[PDB]
Amino acid sequence: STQREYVFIPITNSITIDVKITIGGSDHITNIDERGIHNVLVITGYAVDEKNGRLVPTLDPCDYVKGILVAGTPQQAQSNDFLTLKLPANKLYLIRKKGNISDDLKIYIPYSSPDARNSMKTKPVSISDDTIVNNIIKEVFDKIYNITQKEKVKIEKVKEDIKELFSYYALEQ
Amino acid sequence: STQREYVFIPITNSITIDVKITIGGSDHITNIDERGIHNVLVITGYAVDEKNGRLVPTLDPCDYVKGILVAGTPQQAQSNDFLTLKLPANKLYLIRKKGNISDDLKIYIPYSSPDARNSMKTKPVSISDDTIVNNIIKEVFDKIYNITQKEKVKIEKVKEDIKELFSYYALEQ
Amino acid sequence: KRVLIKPLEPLMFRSQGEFEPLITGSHTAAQSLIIPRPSTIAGMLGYILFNKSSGTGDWLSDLTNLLATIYGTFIETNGEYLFPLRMGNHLALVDQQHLINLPTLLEKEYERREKGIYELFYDKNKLFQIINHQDRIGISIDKSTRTVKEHYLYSARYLAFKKEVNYVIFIDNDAISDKINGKIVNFGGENRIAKLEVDDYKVDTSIEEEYYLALSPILIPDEALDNFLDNISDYVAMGKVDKISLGFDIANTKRKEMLTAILEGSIVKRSIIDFIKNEIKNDLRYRFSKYEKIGYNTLMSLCKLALRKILS
Amino acid sequence: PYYAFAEPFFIHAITHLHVGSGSSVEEEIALPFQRDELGYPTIYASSLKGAIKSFLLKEFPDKRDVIYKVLGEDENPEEASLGTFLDAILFAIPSRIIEIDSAKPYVWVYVTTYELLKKVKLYLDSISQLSNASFSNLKNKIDTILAKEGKNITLDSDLKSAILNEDFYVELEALNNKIPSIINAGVPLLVLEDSIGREVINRSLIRVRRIRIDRDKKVVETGGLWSEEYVPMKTIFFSVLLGKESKESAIFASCILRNLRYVILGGKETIGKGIVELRWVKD
Amino acid sequence: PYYAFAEPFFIHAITHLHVGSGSSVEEEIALPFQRDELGYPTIYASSLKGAIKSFLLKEFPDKRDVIYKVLGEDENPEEASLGTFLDAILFAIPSRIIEIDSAKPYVWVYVTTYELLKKVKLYLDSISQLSNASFSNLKNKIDTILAKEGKNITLDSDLKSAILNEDFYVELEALNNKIPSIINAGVPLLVLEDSIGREVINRSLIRVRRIRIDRDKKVVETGGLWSEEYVPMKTIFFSVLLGKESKESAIFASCILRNLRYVILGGKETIGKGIVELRWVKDVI
Amino acid sequence: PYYAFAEPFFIHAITHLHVGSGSSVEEEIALPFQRDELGYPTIYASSLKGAIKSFLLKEFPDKRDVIYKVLGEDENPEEASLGTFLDAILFAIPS
Amino acid sequence: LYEEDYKLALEAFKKVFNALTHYGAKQAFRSRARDLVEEIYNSGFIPTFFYIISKAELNSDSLDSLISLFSSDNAILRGSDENVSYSAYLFIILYYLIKRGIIEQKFLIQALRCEKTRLDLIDKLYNLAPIISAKIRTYLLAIKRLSEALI
């Protein structure tokens, strides 16, 4: 019963609380194995709210957000609006992948019905200003990943992969 | 409209009696076109019973019966022994294809239950002995393609064709 | 000020007509130009900087609304500016130092002159050290038989670059120096790729002499022809006059116009610079001004790298 | 704008490859490979585009729209294509090695030259900042390598001497101390001098003679003998997919391309001479 | 799937086979064998195909249509073939062993290296992608073998030491004493390292000086003396037969392939060199 | 029936038998005996075929055309040979 | 690369065609060529070099009219047993080894001039067996061709 949850990787700190459990299920797929963040999950056709960060649906395929798929629950007592969907696990648009997938995985997505007020202008947003990347690591890559300063030494690689791999889409609304 | 039925071509007799509907609609699938027969059907895993020529269904995919496809319906009284089937015409193993075909069909094939009391050892039979060639050319092809011997001096051509094109497997019993 | 067009791979600049299967019973073929006509470079730079509701029928009025005075094109291998030089149907890339004594070499008497032009186009020629036509035969495959079609075979003689090579054009404008620098253009035909490099490079222009080198085709007003083709030996020393098509425009999907021109590498005498001005009307001036703008009527002193337009 | 994004990839040969050019070179071969200007094997962009196009039109026989948009149309009704291939330049050919004074056993290594890495750098740097991808970790390694140009360099190992292709004795040298290898394999890589490299490489290329037999007497038919030239299994070519941005690329380069690993390149595939593998530079 | 059917098979030599080599590089032997890019022996799929084709054209004279369809027409081809052969990798060559410490003694063993399983694995993955077949047993055995790369091992028999081909001492480890033999046979399989495996293999090959005697004087003719390289009996190769669907491919794969067991590859047939057996991996696992 | 006839036979050495392998440098013995792939003696079918053919060519000076057909012509080979000798396995050695 | 080798197959030779006269141990040189080459590239350079030196003694007229082909021309290496006529191939190998700097004429000359140093010469070769076998490959195959052409 190892269901997963997606966490987008922004620079605007609308990511206050993500998962109540650091591990939950035993196995974790997005592993940093002395080459960088691997098996990262990229979800297209969507974007992220700058404020109150969530997966806002557009229809344009050129819009996408990249984030981590990790085993954990979103408090298990809230978020009826979350996209709770089970997949045959050969459809996940993984990139820089080096691990395998277990043929059936249940994913939770932070979802919010978009708007009823105006059209959405979107914008590419790269993760930059490493003073934010350090924060991101200390916020999720230290809460989930306890590996901090234990066996891995190249924290700078963990930073710089975020400096190039993650590039999401915003709405400015 | 266009629903065909399969006249197999062995050396043995009892062929021209299969249908009193000898032409049926407008044309046929097998098209003698003064250059050679075209669009010959091949039924694999079936062998002929030379006595009252009819395709006994074996299982060996090596055993096969090659014959022509013609538009008709069995003798107005059969189809209690004729196996009937409706095929998209791309699932039709044709040989010497020339054009494109109806893309949906319905075929009657002369059929005879296996008679499991008789071991179905099968012998590959061919067509030679120009006597047989001629009593085929006249007793089946003239009735379906009367244009034979009308303008075409290619009785020789279709002679070589039905001598070098049709073979079949018989129970030899 | 200067623009280097560095090809990433062999390039195809066709020069003649049909390059597609039209006759069922014959292959097609084509052959690349060694130096792209300035219409090509103009169209490339225009493609980089485009606005989608301007012109629609002019293809150069709106193009000249974007480009500066483009100056002619030539090779640069390692800081070694190679320059085209054309005799009757002969085309050679000669370095700079072999153009100084050139006007005197064609005014020498018979055997000296022929020996000189021979060693120039044959031995002091450097085309075949930098570029060799690389033929590329292709086919079209019909999925029904997984075989070549009914003579859908074409041989396109590409342009292979045996070493690091660029094309050198200079452009007056500077606001563009940043909007094209570092652009991976679709330079040339057959869907090839080149890369642009820009750096300010002072070049002297306002210079007058007796003999010039056509760095770019010198267009002719299409009425002065009878006034020109009669006395051709009085305007060009060596080279090649020909009828060329200005290209193929994208916004209208039309083959551009056809003009008699004096091809690259030809040596024109000074008596032509005024002649065209003498033999051009007031509105054909307004058209050939844009033509010179996109880079056509470019000249160069045989003594020094000093470019010069004609109607300008 | 107009090639806003780029994706390079390695074309790793799974079987031998033949990509013909007719009888296009002055050689002892009747059916040579597709040569560069430097005589090294290459895969023209036409062949690469056509092969991948034909493959995708059958491996996704519903995306005809997307593939026809990106990789262009066939019938006369057309429109500007919006994804192009660069000619596949040879990267590293395999080579049999007999190492002298090395206890790390190696029966084969990859072999490059400096001519080849020059062109690979030409491709890589022409995209690095020109487009919006981060391949510094590779362009800088190649720059490190080209810094040592003129002498036989061994990467990611220490051999100091070897016999390549059973005919060529080379004396190597470690680059600095080690460089993180640029291929997931464990095989060493040698960047030989351009003079001996084009001999080791022309020694790696397969050049077979084939025969056409008279069945009724099992003897060769007169004039029934020719010679071909395949490029060895495990060879590696390098090229880039350059794509414009028109909302089909966002689909092409995202789900069609994510699914491609193996395609068929060049001819003679009944002899099994076309299978190849595409690794995208994303590791 | 790109391919309708995909049939991997092994090629067990029944007699010493000699598929001649095409190359203008001058080598030692007058008539060498076919080498792959690693110097090992191989059967270039052109030879595989041209031999199996001419065999089937006689053994099944009533199915010249199916054969001509899947293996290409002979004289006037209006179409491409639908069947493909992949070059035959050497899988395991036999070598004479002299045991040191083992309960049961052997006199020959099967010798394979790792640079060969690393090509069989390429083929298996490449074909599981371009087909529907997912050869889980071959792959799940070969990856387990390759996990122990870098050390000579024995798959089943417990040897720990031996002298292969009477010149090479090797010290062998065991895999799990649970892996069923890749092929089904009683002789062990040694997965040697590659530097030593190369020499063991090259010792397994059979070079044969032959002569041409004058019938009159019973002395060699002036020129008739050459050398000739073979490959032993019991040698196992690996190839794959692949096909796109045409309803004559579905009949090829179901009538022709179920009745191919012995073919005559290579040349030197008049002297018994070439009879070879085909085992279809769908069977042997 | 890929083969018209198949005629397995034994080869009983009446006298001692020497079919030579050829020289070497690691030979240990000047003139050795032909060997199997696994060390036992054998007669390579080229030796067998040439011996039997040169015997027949003089013991049957009128079937010479049948011999040439089945065992391959000498002067101008226009064709393969219908005959095929398999290498001689050792069956039993006296001890 | 080894284009100079085809001239060395002559300037080393200087004669092995009638310096090896009498057509016996002369026509045995084709055997040397073919068999020795095949065995060097199947067995090894060392197992063959031992086998070759065994057929040619040290400190005798063999050595005399072997080193004589280092600074002279007329060396009739006559003798029926292939021992003066076996140093043909030995000289063939040695001339290449010295004129390609694989080993130096200093060490070689000074080595085949007293019994103490033949052991060290042979050990030196043993240390250079792969290099020698790879380089001398074409130079030897050229003589295997020159035999079946001329000799």
From TrEMBL, chains A, B:
GO biological process: CRISPR-cas system; defense response to virus
Entry-linked InterPro entries: Cmr7A, CRISPR_Cmr7_comp
Protein name in UniProt: CRISPR-associated protein Cmrx
From TrEMBL, chain C:
Top-rank lineage group of the source organism: Archaea
One Pfam match: Cas_Cmr3
CDD domains (UniProt xref): Cmr3_III-B
InterPro entries assigned: CRISPR-assoc_protein_Cmr3 (IPR019117), CRISPR-Cmr3_IIIB (IPR010165), CRISPR_assoc_ribonuclease (IPR052875)
PANTHER family: CRISPR SYSTEM CMR SUBUNIT CMR3 (PTHR37169:SF2), CRISPR SYSTEM ENDORIBONUCLEASE CSX1-RELATED (PTHR37169)
Name of the protein: CRISPR-associated protein, Cmr3 family
Naturally occurring in which organism (per UniProt): Saccharolobus islandicus (strain REY15A) (Sulfolobus islandicus)
Lineage start: Archaea, Thermoproteota, Thermoprotei, Sulfolobales, Sulfolobaceae
UniProtKB/TrEMBL annotation, chain F:
Domain of life (superkingdom): Archaea
Record GO biological process: defense response to virus
Keywords: Antiviral defense
Protein name: CRISPR-associated RAMP protein, Cmr4 family
UniProt source species: Saccharolobus islandicus (strain REY15A) (Sulfolobus islandicus)
Parent-record interval covered: 2 to 96 of 286
UniProtKB/TrEMBL annotation, chain G:
Record's GO cellular component terms: cytoplasm
InterPro entries tied to this protein: AF1862-like_dom_sf (IPR023101), CRISPR-assoc_prot_Cmr5 (IPR010160)
Record key words, sorted: Antiviral defense, Cytoplasm
Principal location class: cytoplasm
GO biological-process terms attached to the record: defense response to virus
Cytoplasm as UniProt keyword: yes
Keyword Cytoplasm tagged: yes
Localization: Cytoplasm
Similarity remark: Belongs to the CRISPR system Cmr5 family.
NCBIfam families: cas_Cmr5 (TIGR01881)
Protein's name according to its UniProt entry: CRISPR type III-B/RAMP module-associated protein Cmr5
Species whose genome carries this gene: Saccharolobus islandicus (strain REY15A) (Sulfolobus islandicus)
Upper taxonomic lineage: Archaea, Thermoproteota, Thermoprotei, Sulfolobales, Sulfolobaceae
